[PDB]
Design a protein around this ligand. Sequence first.
Ligand SMILES: CCCCCCCCCCCCCCCCCCCC(=O)O[C@H](COC(=O)CCCCCCCCCCCCCC)COP(=O)(O)OCCN
Length: 99
Amino acid sequence: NKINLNKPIIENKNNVDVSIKRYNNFVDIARLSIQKHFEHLSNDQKDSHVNNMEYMQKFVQGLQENRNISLSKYQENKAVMDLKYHLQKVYANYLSQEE
Ligand SMILES: CCCCCCCCCCCCCCCCCCCC(=O)O[C@H](COC(=O)CCCCCCCCCCCCCC)COP(=O)(O)OCCN
């Protein structure tokens, strides 16, 4: 139940959405999961990852396989955007910690 950042990114070819309830709950889980990964990163790493798109994609893709849920392409891109917003806030809190 861990994620491998060494797997390359694959095109999501599913165009059948999961329900909003499943999508939101998934995003909740993806949020905390990448938060824990990001918080364990070193200082210089969290600087290069906060806005790293490929990093969030690899996370959304891994999490889909592991949780055996298949988002649609559109849902996967929306989930990545969401993880971005979340990471920015995690990072904000970390920076003010450091202060
Ligand atoms: C496609 C685009 C989609 C984008 C969607 C946007 C949707 C908005 C996002 C949902 C809104 C929730 C946002 C909460 C703020 C997040 C920023 C804090 C994240 C964070 O790192 O806090 C960790 C704990 O989490 C926490 O529990 C702290 C959270 C702070 C909550 C802020 C208080 C607000 C009051 C709540 C009212 C409810 C509002 C009703 C909607 C602390 O880090 P750590 O504990 O892991 O460890 C390190 C400590 N040493």
